């Protein structure tokens, strides 16, 4: 029997489902100071998930694949169990990256912004994807899925993890020391790195220099993992032909940004990690990890390494 803090607006069936196994469901807005100390589980996170008793708190179910907005250091000192939603976000992000490959590579971008038929003005020099090297930093579920879907379209994939272990949908996997070697061979670069001290400004000034073949850079990972002055610059000087920035640093990207009036920068407002029927596909992971904890005291799936993020 648990006390679950609803910080992600449970459906009337899911709530109604939870309340039977002996688990009191509290909406964030119905949380008082007394009850906030009696919280066991937190389904999601907001301003009503900071007030909860961490010394009692056992499990937290994040609503995203990252965990870089949570008090990790608090949770890892309490050793509070954290489940993300990693991998349900893989398939749409790998459809978004392909959508952010064609839009740029086939002049769909340098069209859609152009005002509102005569194609007399020179075409944007379009690039076919088959025979090109798509370098992918991060060899997690998201990275492997994109690497499969690019191997199909006939691309030479190169995974870049911490160690350089063989992963799925990759020809060769390299180490994060050979980052400039991956960038140097790249015709496409794909940020799928979680935000850690190391990865904080990993796509800085230095990275884009090794990148000689002016590669199409894709930001579906995190913004702060990119240095935006060092991105913005590397663009203007054709050190990377185009980019794809699903995230930014800060987020949102502000009203001035030269990325605005640029003409090879695609700017979507954190939509790559979208899932049709999300509440289900998180409550599933949430609701598998709620009962395994009660029985054993662990998580069924998606257990976050609070140190690595």
Does residue 191 belong to any structural domain of this protein?
A: yes
Are 28 and 117 contained in the same domain? no
The Cα-based distances of 155 to 43, 183, 190 in angstroms read 39, 15, 13
Residues 6+ apart with CB under 8 A from 44: 6, 7, 8, 61, 62, 63, 282
Does residue 145 belong to any structural domain of this protein?
A: yes
Are 159 and 284 contained in the same domain? no
Are 177 and 210 contained in the same domain? yes
Task: Retrieve residue 248's tokens.
Answer: 């930014």
Segment (H or E) for 190: strand 188-191
Are 143 and 255 contained in the same domain? yes
Are 31 and 122 contained in the same domain? no
Does residue 289 belong to any structural domain of this protein?
A: yes
Over 47-63, what HEC string results? CCCCCCCCCCCCEEECC
Segment (H or E) for 72: helix 72-77
Does residue 309 belong to any structural domain of this protein?
A: no
Does residue 50 belong to any structural domain of this protein?
A: yes
Are 97 and 132 contained in the same domain? yes
What CATH number is attached to the domain comprising 258?
3.40.50.720
Are 221 and 99 contained in the same domain? yes
Computed over its alpha carbons, how large is the radius of gyration of the chain? 22
Are 69 and 152 contained in the same domain? no
Alpha-carbon distance of 124 to 263, in angstroms, equals: 11
Does residue 7 belong to any structural domain of this protein?
A: yes
SS3 245: strand
Q: What was the experiment behind these coordinates?
A: X-ray
Are 128 and 159 contained in the same domain? yes
Interstrand relation of 172-175 and 265-266 (parallel, antiparallel or unpaired): unpaired
Resolution (A): 3.9
Does residue 131 belong to any structural domain of this protein?
A: yes
Does residue 303 belong to any structural domain of this protein?
A: no
Are 248 and 287 contained in the same domain? no
How many residues appear in the chain? Answer: 309
- 2 backbone dihedrals φ, ψ, rounded to 5°: -120, 165
Are 126 and 169 contained in the same domain? yes
Task: Retrieve residue 91's tokens.
Answer: 């398939």
Is 65:85 a contact under the CB 8 Å cutoff? yes
Interstrand relation of 216-219 and 24-27 (parallel, antiparallel or unpaired): unpaired
Are 211 and 139 contained in the same domain? yes
Structural domain including 98 reads: 90-266
How many structural domains is the chain composed of?
Answer: 2
């Amino acid at each position: 029997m648990m006390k679950i803090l609803n910080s992600f607006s449970l459906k009337p069936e899911q709530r109604q489902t939870l309340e039977a196994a002996g688990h009191t469901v509290i909406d964030a807005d119905k949380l008082d100071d007394a009850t906030a100390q009696q919280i066991d589980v937190v389904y999601g996170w907001n301003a009503a998930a900071t007030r909860v008793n961490f010394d009692r708190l056992q499990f937290v179910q994040a609503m995203s694949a990252g965990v870089d907005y949570l008090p990790l250091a608090e949770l890892a000192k309490h050793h509070v169990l954290l489940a993300n939603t990693s991998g349900i976000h893989a398939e749409p992000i790998a459809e978004y990256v392909l959508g952010a490959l064609f839009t740029i590579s086939r002049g769909i971008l340098p069209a859609i912004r152009a005002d509102r038929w005569t194609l007399r003005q020179e075409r944007p020099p379009m690039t076919l994807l088959k025979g090109k090297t798509a370098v992918i930093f991060g060899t997690g579920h998201i990275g492997s899925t994109i690497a499969t879907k690019l191997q199909a379209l006939g691309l030479h994939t190169i995974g870049v993890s911490a160690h350089g272990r063989p992963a799925a949908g990759f020809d060769q996997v390299m180490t994060d020391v050979a980052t400039h070697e991956a960038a140097g061979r790249a015709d496409v670069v794909i940020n799928a790195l979680p935000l850690t001290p190391d990865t904080k400004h990993f796509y800085d000034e230095a990275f884009f220099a090794a990148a000689s073949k002016q590669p199409l850079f894709i930001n579906i990972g995190r913004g702060p993992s990119v240095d935006m002055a060092a991105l913005t610059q590397a663009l203007k000087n054709k050190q990377i032909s185009a980019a794809a920035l699903d995230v930014v640093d800060p987020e949102p990207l502000p009203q001035d940004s030269p990325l605005w009036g640029m003409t090879n920068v695609l700017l979507t407002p954190h939509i790559s990690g979208t899932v049709p029927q999300l509440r289900d596909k998180v409550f599933k992971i949430f609701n598998d990890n709620l009962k395994t904890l009660i029985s054993s005291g662990q998580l069924a799936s998606h257990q976050v390494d609070l140190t690595r993020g």
